[PDB]
């Protein structure tokens, strides 16, 4: 099932207060008028770049991880005894999580206890950036079960955990004992222009890439655009494929022998060879790894295999370590 | 991870035991006048002529495949001679360093796998062979090694400075607050000059300071008392002289 997202999923992007101002920001937001998957047993969901969650006290806690098999650390949020518990232990998980899930609690590297949260929907946003797992949420009244409310409401932040675990998949948790329902959307690095009112709450927002009118609203840093002609961006057709054209030359470069030469000249009489008109496979040179010092100046060492030079002079000698 | 402490870097610095104390984006001696959200302390042992590679923008085996510092690192790298403690008679071969990896580490990445590095096409069935190298090699620390090769313990303190609440602050004693006077303030590492007044901006419980259009803070939350102070620049203006001649 799919639902429409409309103008929900906006969160305070920088936690610094602003007032009566239109602020343009680049961050992970849920693009407007996008389709969000509606689930109504629980599936395994991809996490990608962040998740928007909505639900309408049946649904408690969430599970995040990469493999979900006690081989890697997995974020667990549970609402028990009115004190919410967050842990990152290598629990061994069940096929369908519902207390069993918290067994084999070893290699624990983070534990946190916080105060409890959760006709009203409960919106959450989970974002994992540079090791910080940021969780935002708000509760709001509803009297329409057929869809997701139309309107605008900014999601107040709750906490930010320095877990730093590579998260790829997540799952919701049901109360252990025809079911409940939730909506999940996926966040994208879109640019948003947010209106801060006198009190400091976001009352409106415009997606800078959703529509040409929204592009003007973003470029003009205004929510009303008077009649006229406006330029917002630039059309440039992107390349379709890469093509490489090189001479038919198949000669191999002397490099092989030069490194492997048995008798080397003395440092005072360093040997110089001029090398041109030959293909040179630096990947064999690299994967022949027995070197103790490899430092290149004025070129990147990792990208010597993608250029073309007029000629290479090879000097060689033997010296002491220091 | 260290946080919620009064980090007294002034005591730590003035000890002559440390052989390398290099800070980037922060001067090594002013650190005691700033407050930090969270400080990461990394520790390890390397050889002497490799400490030079524990710096931003550097290259080499340890920088590329063991410990990579970001281009815009803001913090300190500390190192000192461990030759007496870590090096044992007959050579200390217990400390290992990785030479091979499929790609270079991203900044602060950790890779502790021990799988054999396949450098060629032939698959490695779990035992080293041709084009199949063990990814680690041990340091040959010996008491007779030249200083350049003697071991060095290294601790890298990383400081984060985001728009977030500060917790680790240098131990500068707190003082009383004066309102309606032109003062030079320092609120948990935010410095400036201005007049402090009451404000009616209802910050939400999670916000610490408010910003103006320009590159200036307009309001701040004082610690200990959580009160909201508006900061308005002290009155100034040009002076003109009227003279008949």
């Amino acid at each position: 099932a799919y639902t429409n997202s409309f103008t929900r999923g906006v969160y305070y992007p920088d936690k610094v207060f602003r007032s009566s101002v239109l602020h343009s920001t680049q961050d992970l937001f849920l693009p407007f008028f996008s389709n969000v998957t509606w689930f109504h047993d629980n599936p395994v969901l991809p996490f990608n770049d962040g998740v928007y969650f909505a639900s309408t006290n049946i649904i408690r806690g969430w599970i995040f991880g990469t493999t979900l098999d006690s081989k890697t650390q997995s974020l667990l949020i549970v609402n028990n005894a009115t004190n919410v518990v967050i842990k990152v232990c290598e629990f061994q998980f069940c096929n369908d999580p519902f207390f069993r899930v918290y067994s084999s609690a070893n290699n624990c590297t983070f534990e946190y206890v916080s105060q409890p949260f959760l006709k009203n929907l409960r919106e959450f946003v989970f974002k994992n950036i540079d090791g910080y797992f940021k969780i935002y949420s708000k509760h709001t009244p509803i009297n329409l079960v057929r869809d997701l409310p139309q309107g605008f409401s900014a999601l107040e932040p709750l906490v930010d955990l320095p877990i730093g675990i590579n998260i790829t998949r997540f799952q919701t948790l049901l109360a252990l004992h025809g079911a409940a329902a939730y909506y999940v959307g996926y966040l994208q690095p879109r640019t948003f222009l947010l209106k801060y009112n006198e009190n400091g709450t976001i009352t409106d927002a415009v997606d800078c890439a959703l529509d040409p009118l929204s592009e003007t609203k973003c470029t003009l840093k205004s929510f009303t655009v008077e009649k006229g002609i406006y330029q917002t961006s630039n059309f440039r057709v992107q390349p379709t494929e890469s093509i490489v054209r090189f001479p038919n030359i198949t000669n191999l470069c002397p490099f092989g022998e030069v490194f492997n030469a048995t008798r080397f000249a003395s440092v005072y009489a360093w040997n110089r060879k001029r090398i041109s008109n030959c293909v040179a496979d630096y990947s064999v040179l690299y994967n022949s790894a027995s070197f103790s010092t490899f430092k290149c100046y004025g070129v990147s060492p990792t990208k010597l295999n993608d250029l073309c030079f007029t000629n290479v002079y090879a000097d060689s000698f033997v010296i002491r370590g220091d | 991870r260290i946080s919620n402490c009064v980090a007294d870097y002034s005591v730590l610095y003035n000890s002559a035991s440390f052989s390398t104390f290099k800070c980037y984006g922060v001067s090594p001696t002013k650190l005691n006048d700033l407050c930090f959200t969270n400080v990461y302390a990394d520790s390890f042992v390397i050889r002497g002529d490799e400490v030079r590679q524990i710096a931003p923008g550097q290259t080499g085996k340890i920088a590329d495949y063991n410990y990579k510092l970001p281009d815009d690192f803001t913090g300190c790298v500390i190192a000192w001679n461990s030759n007496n403690l870590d090096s044992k008679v007959g050579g200390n071969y217990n400390y290992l360093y990785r030479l091979f990896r499929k790609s270079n580490l991203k900044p602060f990445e950790r890779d502790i796998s021990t799988e054999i590095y396949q450098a060629g096409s032939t698959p490695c069935n779990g035992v080293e062979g041709f084009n199949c190298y063990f990814p680690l090699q041990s340091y040959g620390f010996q008491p007779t090694n030249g200083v350049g090769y003697q071991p060095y313990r290294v601790v890298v303190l990383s400081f984060e400075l985001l728009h977030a609440p500060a917790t680790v602050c240098g131990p500068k004693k707190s003082t009383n607050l004066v309102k309606n006077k032109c003062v030079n303030f320092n609120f948990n590492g935010l410095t400036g000059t201005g007049v402090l007044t009451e404000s009616n901006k209802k910050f939400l419980p999670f916000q610490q300071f408010g910003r103006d259009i320009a590159d200036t803070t307009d309001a701040v939350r004082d610690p200990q008392t959580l009160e909201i102070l508006d900061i308005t620049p002290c009155s100034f203006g040009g002076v003109s002289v009227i003279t008949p001649g």
């Epitope: - | 290992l96 069935n125 779990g126 035992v127 080293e128 062979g129 199949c132 041990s138």
Partner: antibody
Framework: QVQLVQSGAEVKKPGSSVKVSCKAS????????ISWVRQAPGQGLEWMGR????????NYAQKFQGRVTITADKSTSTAYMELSSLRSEDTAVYYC??????????????????WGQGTAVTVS | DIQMTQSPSSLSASVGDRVTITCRAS??????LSWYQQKPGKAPKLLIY???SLQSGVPSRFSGSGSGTDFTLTITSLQPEDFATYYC?????????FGQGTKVEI
């Protein structure tokens, strides 16, 4: 010169387990692996696997995997070989040998330069 | 599994004889060859590594040569203590299979 001294011969019934030891003398496991080699009566040499004590890494030949375990103590430089589910075909001489694994020793190509005296294990 | 063949399977020789033993792999394995001499009731002794390098502590009467797949060990002056078994070993991939051996009798 680093030498390997192995435990004495052992006679054990089929189905039991055997524990062979290998001690370094005049040296330590200074960046060296401990390999195990098998030799049936009147037969040649059979390579089974090797252990890197430094990391506790153990590798074994497919043939034996499952009932064979090699462990090592780096502090005392003593390795021990524990074999279970003994069958009559397990009667043989077992040798421990110093080998290489570090890239820096690429010119040795994982050769073994010092060998223990061997331990005969008879299953009957 | 790399198929490795020794030759000859056995030989008889007297003190002073010139001995040449060949070892061929079923496919190219570069220089991943080690040579061992073994006496009855004793462990083998490493003689030649890297196909051509002379091992420390080995008498200079032993020498190694060969290229590609076929490599040979030569004994210039057979001695009373040289009556023993000679093994070549490949280390290209796991397992590091050993040959059936070559028995040298007087």
């Amino acid at each position: 010169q680093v030498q390997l001294v192995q435990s004495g011969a052992e006679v054990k019934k089929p189905g039991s387990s055997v524990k062979v030891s290998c001690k370094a003398s005049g040296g330590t496991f200074s960046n060296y692996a401990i390999s195990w080699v098998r030799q049936a009566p009147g037969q040649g040499l059979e390579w089974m696997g090797r252990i890197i004590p430094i990391l506790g890494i153990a590798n074994y030949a497919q043939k034996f995997q499952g009932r064979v375990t090699i462990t090592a103590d780096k502090s005392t430089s003593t390795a021990y070989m524990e074999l279970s589910s003994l069958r009559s075909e397990d009667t043989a001489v077992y040798y421990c040998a110093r080998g290489y694994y570090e890239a820096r020793h690429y010119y040795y190509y994982y050769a073994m330069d010092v060998w223990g005296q061997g331990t005969a294990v008879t299953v009957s | 599994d790399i198929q490795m063949t020794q030759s000859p399977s056995s030989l008889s020789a007297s003190v002073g004889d010139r001995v040449t033993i060949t070892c061929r792999a079923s496919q190219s394995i570069s220089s991943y060859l080690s040579w061992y001499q073994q006496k009855p009731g004793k462990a083998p002794k490493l003689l030649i590594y890297a196909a051509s390098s002379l091992q420390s502590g080995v008498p200079s009467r032993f020498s190694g040569s060969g290229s590609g797949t076929d490599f040979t060990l030569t004994i210039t002056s057979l001695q009373p203590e040289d009556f023993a078994t000679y093994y070549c070993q490949q280390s290209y991939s796991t397992p590091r299979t050993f040959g059936q051996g070559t028995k040298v009798e007087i």
